[PDB]
Amino acid sequence: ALPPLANFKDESGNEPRTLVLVIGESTQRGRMSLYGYPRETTPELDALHKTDPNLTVFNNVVTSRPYTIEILQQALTFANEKNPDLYLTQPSLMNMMKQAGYKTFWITNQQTMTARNTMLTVFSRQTDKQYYMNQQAREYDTNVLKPFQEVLNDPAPKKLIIVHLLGTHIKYKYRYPENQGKFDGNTDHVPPGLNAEELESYNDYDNANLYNDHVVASLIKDFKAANPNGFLVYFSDHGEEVYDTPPHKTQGRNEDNPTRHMYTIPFLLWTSEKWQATHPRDFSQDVDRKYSLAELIHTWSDLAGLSYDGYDPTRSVVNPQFKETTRWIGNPYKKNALIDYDTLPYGDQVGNQ
Ligand code: NA
Numbered sequence: 001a002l003p004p005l006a007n008f009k010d011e012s013g014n015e016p017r018t019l020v021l022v023i024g025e026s027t028q029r030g031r032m033s034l035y036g037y038p039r040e041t042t043p044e045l046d047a048l049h050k051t052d053p054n055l056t057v058f059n060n061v062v063t064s065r066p067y068t069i070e071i072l073q074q075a076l077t078f079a080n081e082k083n084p085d086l087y088l089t090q091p092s093l094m095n096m097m098k099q100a101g102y103k104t105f106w107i108t109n110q111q112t113m114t115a116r117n118t119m120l121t122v123f124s125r126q127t128d129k130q131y132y133m134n135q136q137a138r139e140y141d142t143n144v145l146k147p148f149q150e151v152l153n154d155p156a157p158k159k160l161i162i163v164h165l166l167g168t169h170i171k172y173k174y175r176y177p178e179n180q181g182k183f184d185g186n187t188d189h190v191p192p193g194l195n196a197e198e199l200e201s202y203n204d205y206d207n208a209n210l211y212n213d214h215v216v217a218s219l220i221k222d223f224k225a226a227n228p229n230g231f232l233v234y235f236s237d238h239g240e241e242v243y244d245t246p247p248h249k250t251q252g253r254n255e256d257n258p259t260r261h262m263y264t265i266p267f268l269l270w271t272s273e274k275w276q277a278t279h280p281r282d283f284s285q286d287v288d289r290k291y292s293l294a295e296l297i298h299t300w301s302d303l304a305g306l307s308y309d310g311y312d313p314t315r316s317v318v319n320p321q322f323k324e325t326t327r328w329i330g331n332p333y334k335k336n337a338l339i340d341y342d343t344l345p346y347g348d349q350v351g352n353q
Contacts, residue, residue: 002089002090002091002095004091004099005091005096005099005308005309005310006308006309006310007307007308007309008099008100008306008307008308009306009307009308010100010101010304010305010306011305011306011307012279012304012305012306013278013305015229015278016157016158016229017157017158017159017228017229017230017275018152018158018159018161018223018226018228018229018230019097019102019159019160019161019230019231019232019303019304020160020161020162020163020219020223020230020231020232020233021093021160021161021162021163021232021233021300022162022163022165022216022219022232022233022234022235023072023162023163023164023165023235023236023237024165024167024168024212024216024234024235024236024237024265024266025068025110025164025165025166025167025168025169025236025237026167026168026169026170026236026237026238026239026240026253027167027168027209027212027236027239027240027265027266028236028239028240028241028242028244028261028262028263028264028265028351029059029061029239029264029265029266029351029352030239030244030260030261030264030349030350030351030352031205031206031209031242031244031261031351032045032209032213032266032351033046034046034049034057034213034266035057035059035266035350035351036350036351037189037350037351038189038350039183039188039189039206041206041209041210041213042209042210042213043210043213044213044214044217044218045213045216045217045268048217048220048221048270052270054270054271054272054273054276055220055268055269055270056268056269056270056271056283056284056286056287057267057268057287058267058268058269058286058287058289058291058317059287059288059353060288060289060290060291060353061235061264061265061266061267061291061292061293061317062260062263062264062265062291062292062293062327062329062341063075063236063237063238063239063263063265063292063293063294063329064080064081064263064292064293064294064327064328064329065081065238065255065329065331065332066238066239066240066253066254066255066258066262066263067238067253067255068120068237068238069118069119069120071237071238071293071294072119072120072123072237073087073119074087074293074294075235075237075293075294075296075297076092076093076094076123076296076297077090077091077092077093077297078090078091078297078310079294080292080294080295080328081292081294081328081329081330081332081338082328082332082338084332084333090310092123092126093296093297093300094106094123094126094127094160094162095126096297096301096306096308097160097304098126098128100158100304100306101158102156102158102159102160103128103129103154103156103158103159103160104126104127104128104129104159104160104162105127105128105129105130105131105151105154105159105160105161105162106123106124106126106127106129106130106131106162106164107130107131107133107144107147107148107151107161107162107163107164108124108130108131108132108133108134108144108163108164108165109133109134109139109140109141109143109144109164109165109166110134110164110165110166111134111135111136111137112124112132112134112135114132114135124164127160127162129151131144131147131151133147134166137174138174138177139166140175140176140177140211140215141165141166141167141175141211141212141215142214142215142218144163144165144215144219145215145218145219145222148161148163148219148222148223149222152222152223152226152228163219165212165215165216167208167212167236168205168208168209168212168240170252171204172201172204172205172207172208172242173204173207173208175207175208175211175212176207176208176210176211177211180207180210180211181203181204181207182206182207182210183203183206183207183210184200184203184207185203186203187199190202190203191243191244191246191248192248193247193248193249194243194248198243198251201242201243201251202242202243205240205242216234216268219232219234220232220234220270223270223272224270224272227272227273227274228272228274228275229272229274229275229278230272230274230275231269231270231271231272231275231303232269232270233267233268233269233299233300233303234266234267234268234269234270235265235266235267235268235293235296236265236266237265237293238253238262238263238265239253239260239261239262239263239264239265240252240253240261240262241253241254241259241261241262242261244259244261244349244352245259245260245261245346246346255329255330255331256331258329258330258339258344259344259346260341260344260345260346260347260349260352261352263329263341263344264351264352264353265293267291267293267317269283269303269318279305281318283318286317286318286322289317289322289324290324290327290342291317291324291327292325292327292328292341294328295312295315295316295317298311298312298313298315298316298319299315299316299317299318299319301316302316302318302319303318326340327340327341327342328340328341329341
């Protein structure tokens with residue numbers, strides 16, 4: 001029902017390309033070894049970072065809200081903390097890619113109620129083809145690998161593939177097979193004072209991070225094996241507090257009682273050899289920019305070569321005109337409840353910038 005973006009231009013040429021957006025779940029930045037966590041929770045992404053120069057790891061990206069649909073309404077559209085309702089009145093990322101001539105796909109391991117009017121159902125239905133892999137629980141994110149490959153074989157020249165993961169969502173133990181609890185009973189690098197149940201939950205979160213590492217690295221590896229022209233962006237919708245913050249008694253997500261570990265997120269960009277060769281771009285000076293996921297659509301636009309009325313290059317984290325703005329958190333529907341993420345304590349801790 002919304003009109004297309006005005007003065008729409010695509011400067012990325014007309015060669016076929018495949019662009020991938022991997023939406024993880026409840027994965028914070030501070031529990032991945034890729035970001036300095038002393039437990040080896042992400043070995044495959046670490047090795048990929050060591051061996052592949054086209055993997056760009058962003059170190060200072062946070063989400064704006066710690067609830068899935070509440071953040072995705074901002075990340076996937078032009079809405080943000082100051083204007084949270086723009087997802088109703090302006091196009092989404094998927095709409096934008098359709099206007100650019102892409103065939104769009106939604107692959108998900110999250111239980112979607114297709115017969116019901118949920119906001120996630122609407123977003124996934126904004127694409128040309130959907131793969132609902134979890135419609136009924138032990139359904140692991142590797143479920144997405146088979147349809148992903150299938151979509152890679154789809155003959156459309158320009159393709160957008162969205163992969164929605166369960167990631168490290170509660171309950172953590174159910175995110176990975178029972179025989180893959182590498183950190184079960186381990187007490188190294190554990191905060192003090194946990195009881196048996198809290199300790200088991202902590203180690204469960206690290207195990208879920210291990211499996212999520214395997215899944216994301218597998219997506220990148222299979223994508224690369226297709227020898228594609230394009231790139232893949234991986235981000236988590238939000239983090240998750242798992243006894244990280246002193247006094248180490250809190251587990252979960254609470255917007256009105258925020259901690260940094262609820263808001264820090266991984267943010268990775270893998271660029272294929274063909275795309276890097278055809279679209280030369282240096283990201284090495286962008287990796288430490290302080291950025292909020294709420295403006296993702298501009299970064300994506302920048303990466304896709306798209307410009308239009310409403311495009312803001314200064315809010316793209318890969319743009320030379322990038323200008324840091326306040327990384328707002330807090331409920332945007334309460335009266336003047338927005339606060340600067342930087343004001344939260346314990347910002348000096350590893351992975352908690
Ligand atoms: Na937005």
